[PDB]
């Protein structure tokens with residue numbers, strides 16, 4: 446079975462919109478989304494379909510760009526740093542589950558370097 450996906454809304458959690466968060470959706474996510482290596486990260490890992498039955502035995506804080514995108518569209522975050530942490534969790538989980546040089550890891554590393562370039566400068 447797959448676990449329930451991470452929440453994309455939470456009425457207990459305060460919402461906010463900042464220039465930097467609009468930018469993380471408008472520019473950073475929506476450009477990463479178009480990368481040729483983006484597709485494995487556009488939705489939660491379906492460990493049933495991919496025959497990775499050990500995935501959620503190892504990965505306990507799963508994160509993906511589909512969840513991030515919905516969070517950004519919902520103004521789920523308080524600030525840009527909260528969103529950047531979700532990106533880092535997504536990359537870090539892929540390096541934890543897989544090994545250096547794996548095809549998926551090369552994909553994650555391409556996106557990560559592009560992500561780092563894009564958030565080097567955020568709007569004021």
Ligand SMILES: Nc1cc(-n2ccnc2)c2cc(F)cc(O)c2n1
Pocket residue numbers: 485486490495497538539540542543549
């Ligand atoms: N062994 C794998 C396979 C993945 N995948 C998913 C679709 N096609 C390959 C995968 C995807 C991720 F977003 C993170 C990972 O850690 C992954 N690990």
